[model samples]
Target: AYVQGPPSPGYYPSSQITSLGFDQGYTNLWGPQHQRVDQGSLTIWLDSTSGSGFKSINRYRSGYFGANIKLQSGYTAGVITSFYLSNNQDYPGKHDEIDIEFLGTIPGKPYTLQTNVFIEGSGDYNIIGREMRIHLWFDPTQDYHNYAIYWTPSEIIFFVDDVPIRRYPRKSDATFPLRPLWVYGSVWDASSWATENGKYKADYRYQPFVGKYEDFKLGSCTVEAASSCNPASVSPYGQLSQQQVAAMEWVQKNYMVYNYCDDPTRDHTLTPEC
Candidate 1:
């Protein structure tokens, strides 16, 4: 008999999202020289001179944000190509962040896709890193893959090629991030701690490290939208169908490299949800 595992929040069904062009949705936030919009894709690169970034025109309270991304192959250790959600600019030290960042790797090694969630407190910004890392099922550098973040008031799910890899439920108000956040895509240097805890660093020898993005999808409730504008659901039911659970479990069993919940080095007291 097949053993059952944990759960989901809704019936996995209709995804009513319209694909967007770069100009229809986002604006370049920095490194204009390194950001390009051509044909139907956006490319952002990092070099010795500068890195590039772009952000959504609106801040969202809850929704699905996604893109088809292709990484820079070769020795790219210490570089981070990411699409994430953050309220850092408006909240400054006190913000909420959800991330899906590709941690670059040396040749012969696979890239690490990190999914993280954290809320910075109002006072001391009591932040705890809730990070989960996984090795992808395929070589991301070889082609474009759909990577997306699905956030609702109740849960946050990270999907790769439409397969749910990680799901985080709101255990309590204390653990969840409620503030509105903007969608962002950035390619930058994070040599200090991006790869193997600083064991590797970015090489200027491969100066133009590129991150290509296409097929953008945005579905969400804007901060100013009406309360009647309830968040969209990825499914119809409230629990993951058996197949969805199985798929997520397969990734967790085979590809999951690191989960903060299981790390003895972390202070479990801070993560009561664990």
Candidate 2:
């Protein structure tokens, strides 16, 4: 018998996950009128008046945060739908944040998925972007797809449906974000700089930008927990496997649109990881 299957990247799959209800894991942060939470999914929208957002009930030092998201289609330029981890509320301008954001687009274009890490230092107190962007091969508005960010002490990996797309390692203590952070999801109008470097502004004529989310999978160990109480491994093998590397390479080669490390305009000294 000849049988073939999807390659065993050996990363954890969503099928093995037990989803969380909105009440069980998160609280609406704003725009309650634009948010809906029921059963197994959460829906949010952004209109001319307001946008909606939610945050996890707990703050974790390290973990894997995964969600299945479907975005609004057509004339979405400058709108940003996102899922991420951050401590901005507590730390304000000098906080640590990790992101998985969908940068909106116009018709006949692939949605730009942006990932970023922000680390702030207390000495001079400044923040910089370690950002990357990719055009998703499939239509994100057509269906739900799992997107995840794995944060371990030593590294961070971004995944699209279990396929590792990017790995940001802790090259040095000065460059990494070690603070505890709360998971969050939001739909906002970033009309100033989200699309084509702000060339395209969010048009109110295409109002009511919507974001649908499900399967709140969080393998998180709260900051109050002991060091030994670490979150479960994002991949059973502990490190990304060869197959996963290949998958990531495929995405990077075919879809990568922006990477800070490769940008000549960036101040190289500040980005030693490059």
Candidate 3:
């Protein structure tokens, strides 16, 4: 039950959008902005830019699955953006979620994007992390980079610019698609953990807290079809550029490799199959 748009005009919606709970926050680039359409293309915009430059938008539904987003640039540490739909009357007690997070501060860094998928409870959480090479002077305010997640009974896929980067396989026992989801996005300061992660750090803002967001597209999507995203054709891992490849390689070979090898329970670590 997914929908898309035509090339011209992208995804201009002719219908009104309905909002739920404490404002989807679209007066500025912070929360809940969505386009109403069954299928087609649309543009995402920066709702407000008076303070810290920020802009973001989302398209999603609730129930067993949902996606959340908020885009903020200057002073990354303090901005905490999220989207979710839980405890709905229809589903009663089930839970499902998808998240795209921008970490706030990491010292001498620009920003890092983290994605997570949660089903049922906090105990069942999975996280995926990546770094965006945005220079201090670069302006995200000038353009829009699409960020999205596609979830179905089988798996979840994360995308930036329609390019799939990571995929998580779904468990048979997983519960989803039971409730309708709402698109959500926002920005706020979270300097504590964001800075410590060593990814992004504030640049001593004159006002301390600066964030922004804009543009919104919403509709049903054909993402549920597994064949729609072929691992090879979709260029999963988001077509890692050389620089990205090098960085990932360094982290994997140095950090992950050492840690996994040291794990005594690792299958091949103590195996004498040679």
Q: List the residue pairs that clash in candidate 2.
A: none
Which lDDT tens digits does candidate 1 get at residues 235-274? 5555456677778898899899999999999998888988
Which ranges of candidate 1 are over 4 A from the true structure?
1-16, 122-127
lDDT of 3 by residue, 107-182 (tens): 3555455565444542133321122221212233345454555554555555443434444554334323333344
Worst 10 residues of 3 by lDDT: 6-15
- List, residue by residue over 156-238, the lDDT tens digit for candidate 2: 99988888889999998778888889999999999899988899999989999999999888877899898688665766666
Best candidate according to TM-score? 2
Better of 1 and 2 by TM-score: 2
As a whole number from 0 to 100, the lDDT of residue 137 in candidate 3 is 21
For residue 27, give model 3's deviation from the true position in Å: 8.9
